[PDB]
Design a protein around this ligand. Structure first.
Ligand SMILES: Nc1nc2c(ncn2[C@@H]2O[C@H](COP(=O)(O)OP(=O)(O)OP(=O)(O)O)[C@@H](O)[C@H]2O)c(=O)[nH]1
Ligand SMILES: Nc1nc2c(ncn2[C@@H]2O[C@H](COP(=O)(O)OP(=O)(O)OP(=O)(O)O)[C@@H](O)[C@H]2O)c(=O)[nH]1
Ligand SMILES: [Ca+2]
Ligand SMILES: [Mg+2]
Ligand SMILES: [Mg+2]
Lengths: 419, 440, 66
């Protein structure tokens, strides 16, 4: 079929990736041992996209880390042994929440063994569409090693699609002060080397856990259930029989008007009625970024509706959201909101709506990181941890410069008219 | 003699071909295994249905058809469907990797690796012919394959078969059932590239077909299947000239003569009637006059345009069933009085009429009611240019900001192709205007 | 008149042939310029990645001196 290759790098990466494999393995009727046990045939029709077949099924996944902890955790836990044991690739050193270490020194040791497993999976594919990477941008392994992998893989498969779920750092969720540096460095890489990045901002997941789910003390599991829900959502049209945006590439084509602006904002409901699903979905209190879309303009949007409902209601409500708030949709990309429906709902819910936005409000997120970066950089603070691995401020200077440029571009198009 | 090879390209093409060939088989009494109990001439013959259907000495009737998708699915269903035995395996060519809604991928990157194979299959089919007329090419404007690979195929077919007739059935994009945001790009691109290589194209606007299915057949949210069976009806009306016979039948090629005034003005507007539901049809017989008038109702049109805002250069009426000349004639008059069919000053203002008495068939379990007579009108209105305008305008909105253009340049294309295509469409809009102006 | 008839059919044959020929040319020019363009783009992409590689070696060497 059209095969995706999935990569988990780092702690956060392997955590959200393991949850994602649990969630969609359930959706597709795959027990923790790799045996199909579901009713519908619609669960196995496109199962080739995310699973190799061995009567058993094995996630086409590659698990990567510079420390053995999180990956042991994964081998041990739920669906722990659905993964090909060969595909665990791990060092012992760790990366010390250091971008330079994952990208230049420790990651460089491990990267060739990763690429080895990557070749093995890619060359067992009829038609490889591309690669999907999960990682945070705030630590060291995921951030730096992941971006290094992105480059390596592009070098070897320059014609395939690079796709990442990249977790953006937020003070309210961590403490590692350098996170802005790490993030600004990998945003740099991502601007250049991915076709589509879902921006999962920890800030928003926090807020939605706190001030909506009303969880006063959220754990990383609380955030990661929002994350795995989103990932199922944005992978539905790829995992189940359907049409609109079914390939990573068609997705790229229908969502990326200009090659740099490929940073998407996901949203999900219910965190009902087609109206309730639709309005919740488009509200900010359901965005997984932090930006308010009412602050910028939708360039492109794709909505997925899962469950049994009326497509007539879905079309009416979708056009109602646009026609009503037609101010927040650019007029130089006609008919830029597409909608798909899949009958199979996520676990536990009978109806659900996921949403993917190329919105200029994403500038807010980059702006936030930019600020945090400059605070420290204006006094060269904590730079020693990096300079010592062989880096030069120019690099930081370039990365900050590139991200400022990204923000400036998102603003320009937001302020563009047709006539 | 007089054979027509049909080529179905990309999803829309293949699925519409599914509709058409099933309809055809019903109209001719061919069972899903190719056996036609009515045929007594075994392994061959020169019957009219032979223009679309070769025969095996084992008695199977085989569509003179090729299905081409850059992607396994759809076609695969044909291979595994009620009609899997009508076709032979090499008539269904599939790729591995579609065009991701990108004409540069269909026309070059991905298409170039399957084109020679497709041309060989087409040649296999051609060499089975004793006097081949030309091709019926079925494709969407908006698909990556349907636009790019189709235009490639058209160029190569003009090379390998010369000025043989090539006729298009084109699915014009409508947001209601859209799949890509770049479909205006693909549309302008493919129109500009094909303009020179096609003698007659029937544009079918998905928005018009969606609307009719909803209002006349009462369908909440019509499906591709709903649309495709309505469309196949229209196609069958257009091709029934070549698949059946009779003393009142007229060959489309004759209409073509009257439908294409100048080589570029080769986009005829179609209107079909009656599109009703069984519920309604029950105890409601439509008269020739009824169906005819409908033909002049802008709502029963296949493309959204206001013929009144333009002039006519041809009006051909193709009837099917219990239709007799007298009845038609009257209707025509009545209309001509009650209506205003303005014509250009250089064109005769009469209506060319044809009748096939073979009554229309319905797909069982379908939404269309079996009917006693129907008509498909084919006109050349400068008004069709409206549908170009819309497309052109959308294209312009995007192109001014170069939106999505990178996806094409990254596949080999140049911004220049965009501007040339666009300029060609500008020319096309000017051309239509010109032909509609009166003379000295 | 017979010569005129021979000239007209000659004109028809020549014009169809010229059509097929100009088509063949135009298409070959297009396919070749597309292939040159696409290759160029992928080459420059792979070369950007190569400069990325050379700068990584630069970084590792800069540290194995500190
Ligand atoms: N949403 C979410 N964020 C996480 C999770 N685990 C870690 N993080 C975030 O990850 C960022 C740091 O990334 P890590 O995964 O710890 O970094 P790493 O790739 O393991 O790099 P090393 O620490 O050097 O091994 C912080 O900003 C955390 O907020 C998780 O399970 N869910
Ligand atoms: N009327 C009708 N329109 C269709 C049908 N199938 C697809 N379309 C329309 O076709 C356009 C998209 O073109 P497709 O035929 O899907 O694309 P394709 O030829 O496979 O090209 P790629 O998938 O990019 O390779 C959209 O505007 C759809 O509305 C159909 O079966 N009937
Ligand atoms: Ca026979
Ligand atoms: Mg950590
Ligand atoms: Mg397709």
């Amino acid at each position: 079929m059209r095969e995706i290759v999935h990569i988990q790098a780092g702690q956060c990466g392997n955590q959200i990736g393991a949850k994602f494999w649990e969630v969609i393995s359930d959706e597709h009727g795959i027990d923790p041992t790799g045996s199909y046990h579901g009713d519908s045939d619609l669960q196995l029709e496109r199962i080739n996209v995310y699973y190799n077949e061995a009567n058993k099924y094995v996630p086409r996944a590659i698990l990567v880390d510079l420390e053995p902890g999180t990956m042991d955790s994964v081998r041990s836990g739920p669906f722990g042994q659905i993964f090909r044991p060969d595909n665990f690739v791990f060092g012992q050193s760790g990366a010390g929440n250091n971008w330079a270490k994952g990208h230049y020194t420790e990651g460089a040791e491990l990267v060739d063994s990763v690429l080895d497993v990557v070749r093995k999976e890619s060359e067992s594919c009829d038609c490889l569409q591309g690669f999907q990477l999960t990682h945070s941008l705030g630590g060291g392994t995921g951030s730096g090693m992941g971006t290094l992998l992105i480059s390596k893989i592009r070098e070897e498969y320059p014609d395939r699609i690079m796709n990442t779920f990249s977790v953006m750092p937020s003070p309210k969720v961590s403490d590692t002060v350098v996170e802005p540096y790490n993030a600004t460095l990998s945003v740099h890489q991502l601007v250049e080397n991915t076709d589509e990045t879902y921006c999962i901002d920890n800030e928003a997941l926090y807020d939605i856990c706190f001030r909506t789910l009303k969880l006063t003390t959220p754990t990383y599991g609380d955030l990661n259930h929002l994350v795995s829900a989103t990932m199922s959502g944005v992978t539905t049209c790829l995992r189940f029989p359907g049409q609109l945006n079914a390939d990573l590439r068609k997705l790229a084509v229908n969502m990326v008007p200009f090659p740099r602006l490929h940073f998407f904002m996901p949203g999900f409901a219910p965190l009902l009625t087609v109206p309730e699903l639709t309005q919740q979905m488009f509200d900010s209190k359901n965005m997984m970024a932090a930006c308010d879309p009412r602050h910028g303009r939708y360039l492109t949007v794709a909505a997925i509706f899962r469950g049994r409902m009326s497509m007539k209601e879905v079309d009416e409500q979708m056009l109602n959201v646009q026609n009503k708030n037609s101010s927040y949709f650019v007029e130089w990309i006609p008919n830029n909101v597409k909608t798909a429906v899949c009958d199979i709902p996520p676990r536990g819910l009978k109806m659900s709506a996921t949403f993917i936005g190329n919105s200029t409000a994403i500038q807010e997120l980059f702006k936030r990181i930019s600020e945090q970066f400059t605070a420290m950089f204006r006094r060269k603070a904590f730079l020693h941890w990096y300079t010592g691995e062989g880096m030069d401020e120019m690099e930081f200077t370039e990365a900050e410069s590139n991200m400022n440029d990204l923000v400036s571009e998102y603003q320009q198009y937001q302020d563009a008219t047709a006539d | 003699m007089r054979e027509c090879i049909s080529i179905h390209v990309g999803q829309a093409g293949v699925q519409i071909g599914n509709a058409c060939w099933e309809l055809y088989c019903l109209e001719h009494g061919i069972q899903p295994d190719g056996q036609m109990p009515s045929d007594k001439t075994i392994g061959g013959g020169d019957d009219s249905f032979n223009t679309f259907f070769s025969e095996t000495g084992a008695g199977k009737h085989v569509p003179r058809a090729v299905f081409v998708d850059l992607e396994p699915t759809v076609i695969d269903e044909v291979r595994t469907g009620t009609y899997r035995q009508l076709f032979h395996p090499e008539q269904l060519i599939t790729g591995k990797e579609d065009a991701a809604n990108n004409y540069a991928r269909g026309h070059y990157t991905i298409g170039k690796e399957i084109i020679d194979l497709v041309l060989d299959r087409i040649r296999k089919l051609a060499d089975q012919c004793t006097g081949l007329q030309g091709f019926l090419v079925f494709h969407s404007f908006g698909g990556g394959t349907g636009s790019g690979f189709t235009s490639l195929l058209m160029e190569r077919l003009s090379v390998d078969y010369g000025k043989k007739s090539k006729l298009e059935f084109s699915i014009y994009p409508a947001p209601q059932v859209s799949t890509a945001v770049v479909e205006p790009y693909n549309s302008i691109l493919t129109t500009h590239t094909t303009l020179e290589h096609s003698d007659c194209a029937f544009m079918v606007d998905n928005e018009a077909i969606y609307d009719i299915c909803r209002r006349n057949l009462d369908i909440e949210r019509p499906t591709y299947t709903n649309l495709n069976r309505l469309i196949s009806q229209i196609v069958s009306s257009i091709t029934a000239s070549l698949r059946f016979d009779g003393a009142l039948n007229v060959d489309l090629t004759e209409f073509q003569t009257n439908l294409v005034p100048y080589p570029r003005i080769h986009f005829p507007l179609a209107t079909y009637a009656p599109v009703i539901s069984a519920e309604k049809a029950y105890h409601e017989q439509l008269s020739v006059a009824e169906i005819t008038n409908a033909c002049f109702e802008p709502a029963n049109q296949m493309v959204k345009c206001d013929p009144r805002h333009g002039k006519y250069m041809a009006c051909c009426l193709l009837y099917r069933g219990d239709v007799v000349p007298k009845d038609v004639n009257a209707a025509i008059a009545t209309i001509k009085t009650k209506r205003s069919i303005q014509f250009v000053d250089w064109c005769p203002t009469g209506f060319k009429v044809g009748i096939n008495y073979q009554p229309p068939t319905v797909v069982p379990g379908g939404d269309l009611a079996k009917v006693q007579r129907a008509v498909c009108m084919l006109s050349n209105t400068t008004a069709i240019a409206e549908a170009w305008a819309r497309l052109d305008h959308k294209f312009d909105l995007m192109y001014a900001k170069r939106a999505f253009v990178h996806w094409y340049v990254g596949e080999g294309m140049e911004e220049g192709e965009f501007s040339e295509a666009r300029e060609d469409m500008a020319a096309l809009e000017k051309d239509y205007e010109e032909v509609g102006v009166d003379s000295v | 008149k017979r010569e005129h008839e021979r000239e007209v059919i000659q004109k028809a044959i020549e014009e169809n042939n010229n059509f097929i020929k100009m088509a063949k040319e135009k298409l070959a020019q297009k396919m070749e310029s597309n292939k040159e363009n696409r290759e160029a783009h992928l080459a420059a992409m792979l070369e950007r990645l190569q400069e990325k590689d050379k700068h990584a070696e630069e970084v590792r060497k800069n540290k194995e001196l500190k």
